[PDB]
């Protein structure tokens, strides 16, 4: 069996609010391993927050996390929870549940900000005689004016991955983010192949599919 720790999705919260993040365990005996929580700040530094005993439900907190943090579990659902109350700017981070040192979950990205959520506008980057290098053409999608991070982009529902480049977002003076995703393909094939970018911004339930074709 493959150990799986599925965590809840990216969230944006305002200062002072409460958030509850889940870690659902499958592929192993839940009561066999304690569940630890680790905070990774955007800078990538890691901080161990404490752990919860899955047999008894008893949590233990690291000193820095005694106050606004609560670990709990739901036995019947093999699920561990991290609840943070009175959220502060410094709580912005990715939070991992982990089976001690053995296995990390995929993490939950939390942003704490007074700014409103904003879904992206998605525009085609259309191939042409000037996005043509040798017999290679480039095309893509511009994903503009969203908040907060992150946003996911795929091509042809995951079927197109070769040569795909999805750029780190830039911060605009407006406080909104923007990025592009591009791909290179044969220029000879632009009339017969179909290229769709799939953009998902979970913090705003925005999903868009944009077909990209020569202008």
């Amino acid at each position: 069996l493959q150990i799986q720790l599925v965590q809840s999705g990216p969230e944006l919260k305002k200062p002072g609010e409460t958030v509850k993040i889940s870690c659902k365990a499958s592929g192993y005996t839940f009561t066999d391993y304690s569940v630890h929580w680790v905070k990774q700040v955007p800078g990538k530094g890691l901080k161990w927050m404490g752990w919860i005993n899955t047999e008894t439900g008893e949590p233990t907190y690291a000193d820095d996390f005694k106050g606004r943090f609560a670990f709990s579990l739901e036995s019947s659902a093999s699920t561990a929870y991290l609840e943070i109350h009175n959220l502060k700017n410094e709580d912005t981070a990715t939070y991992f549940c982990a089976l001690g040192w053995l296995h990390w979950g995929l993490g939950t990205t939390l942003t704490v900000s007074s700014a409103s959520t904003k879904g992206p506008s998605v525009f085609p980057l259309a191939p042409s005689s000037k996005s043509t290098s040798g017999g290679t053409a480039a095309l893509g999608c511009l994903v503009k004016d969203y908040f907060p991070e992150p946003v996911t982009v795929s091509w042809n529902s995951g079927a197109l991955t070769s040569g795909v480049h999805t750029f780190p977002a830039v911060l605009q003076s407006s406080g909104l983010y923007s990025l592009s995703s591009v791909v290179t393909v044969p220029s000879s094939s632009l009339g017969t192949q179909t290229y769709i970018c799939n953009v998902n911004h979970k913090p705003s339930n925005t999903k868009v599919d944009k077909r990209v074709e020569p202008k």
Binding site: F123, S128, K130, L142, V170, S180
Partner: protein, 218 residues
């Protein structure tokens, strides 16, 4: 006080096939006299992923981990070696002590891959009709699959060098060919965009014999 883990070096650039040595020094001994085990683990965190266990109890390689990864050391001084580094080994590496609570982590070592010069392919993209309707024009210039990262991108509009209206973004290194890609985006109001005809990005890079310009006409 808490056990402190010092990782060195904090960044390493190595070419494929070189031996990589990363160090983790603990303020306090991680050797459990009760177990003769060293309570240190090494992780690899590749771009955009969660940490993966490479080595546990200092020297025991995790199942599935390539044998080029070797953990060693004891007490206060530990080492993770990659006998022959591969392109896909591009990652942040960090150590974890779980000898005593609170568990603590090293600061990490970022492993970057050195490779031969690779020239960028350059492409330019006009703004879409949909966006212009909206009141803005984003013009994107793409530099694809190049090395090293050092590159100069200049925007010229009707032959006039632009300043102050563009932003660049560079990708993480590619895990297969160790190259970078870069985007430069020029953003104008629709009004300003329609004031000019020729939009060009000029790219300077050591893989190019001289600067390459890509352009279109509005």
């Amino acid at each position: 006080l808490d056990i402190q883990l010092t990782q060195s070096p904090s960044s390493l650039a190595m070419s494929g096939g070189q031996k990589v040595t990363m160090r983790c020094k603990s303020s306090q001994s991680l050797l459990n006299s009760r177990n003769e085990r060293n309570y240190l683990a090494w992780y690899q965190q590749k771009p955009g992923q969660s940490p993966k266990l490479l080595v546990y109890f200092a020297s025991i390689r995790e199942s599935g981990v390539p044998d080029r990864f070797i953990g060693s050391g004891s007490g206060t001084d530990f080492t993770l070696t990659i006998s022959s580094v591969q392109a896909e080994d591009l990652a942040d590496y960090f150590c974890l002590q779980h000898y005593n609570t609170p568990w603590t982590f090293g600061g990490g070592t970022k492993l970057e891959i050195k490779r031969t010069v690779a020239a960028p392919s350059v492409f330019i993209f006009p703004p879409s009709d949909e966006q212009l309707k909206s009141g803005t024009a984003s013009v994107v210039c793409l530099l694809n699959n190049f090395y090293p990262r050092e590159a100069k991108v200049q925007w010229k509009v009707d032959n006039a060098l632009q300043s102050g209206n563009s932003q660049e973004s560079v990708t993480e290194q590619d895990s297969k060919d160790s190259t970078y890609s870069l985007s430069s985006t020029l953003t104008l109001s629709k009004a300003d965009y329609e004031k000019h005809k020729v939009y060009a990005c000029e790219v300077t890079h050591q893989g190019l014999s001289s600067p390459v310009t890509k352009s279109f006409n509005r």
